[PDB]
Design a protein around this ligand. Sequence first.
Ligand SMILES: O[C@@H]1[C@@H](O)[C@H](O[C@@H]2CO[C@@H](O[C@@H]3CO[C@@H](O)[C@H](O)[C@H]3O)[C@H](O)[C@H]2O)OC[C@H]1O
Ligand SMILES: [Ca+2]
Ligand SMILES: [Cl-]
Length: 302
Amino acid sequence: GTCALPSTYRWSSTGVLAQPKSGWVALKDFTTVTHNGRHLVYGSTSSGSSYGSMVFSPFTNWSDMASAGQNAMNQAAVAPTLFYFAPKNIWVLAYQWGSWPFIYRTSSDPTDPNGWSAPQPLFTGSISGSDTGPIDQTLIADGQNMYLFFAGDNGKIYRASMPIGNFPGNFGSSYTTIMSDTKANLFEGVQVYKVQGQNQYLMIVEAMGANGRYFRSFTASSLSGSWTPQAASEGNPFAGKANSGATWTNDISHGDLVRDNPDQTMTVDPCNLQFLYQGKSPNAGGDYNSLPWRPGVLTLRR
Ligand SMILES: O[C@@H]1[C@@H](O)[C@H](O[C@@H]2CO[C@@H](O[C@@H]3CO[C@@H](O)[C@H](O)[C@H]3O)[C@H](O)[C@H]2O)OC[C@H]1O
Ligand SMILES: [Ca+2]
Ligand SMILES: [Cl-]
């Protein structure tokens, strides 16, 4: 019936799942749902000079991602979050960079990279001690409230909230600072999920380790509650070089746990946990913006 999250995570990994289309040096920052029995994946793109976004043509097996069409969005949605918002029967794509710090668009057909509505403000606030400003938003609702979580490349995690009845809409400028640590420990790539079958929420945050990017996990009993470190060191990570089972990459970086239910609750099944992540060749160097990031999938070994 129900499974619990392990205290120690062990994964197996695919190899590189796809190469970027001509003109891109990287595929990045994945968000994914199952839509009509197929994997639906949005991501950031990089040409090395600037970031854009794209969607893969829907595919049934991860092993077929390599042949999936890669469809550029004509208006960039960097570091996107995709979900179905059930109370209004509408799909939401939230992202960073444009007229506001965070932005969203809506659609009745999430497979179309250019079928999204006019951009609307999601968040208009500002944070201190950050070179980036607000970065890597995610959205998650319980039964009562819609939450915004984000990072700032600065060791902090931030949260905002509104009643679900007021979403889709603008969180405005206000936020709460919920976590504070070193820049390395709480860097970016924050994601939050409901653990199916448990009275528990799961937060993962990307950290900069000695050996590469990795994820630290935290749990809470409430989205407005305190977060308790779970697998939160480089030696005992949520997912990292230590436990990924990946050979092609020493980095486990910005992605999304695989969500079978596409809705706003961001529910994951702890019995069948999988992680769509970005990784890169250990030999790749140079400017961050030119790094050859690629998609991979981790599968939890039970
Ligand atoms: O163009 C800007 C982007 O580059 C920026 O993205 C962040 C840039 O810094 C990255 O972190 C660095 C990785 O390499 C390490 O050696 C450095 O210490 C880190 O700072 C981070 O991963 C990116 O998200 O955002 C703002 C854009 O204008
Ligand atoms: Ca994200
Ligand atoms: Cl809040």
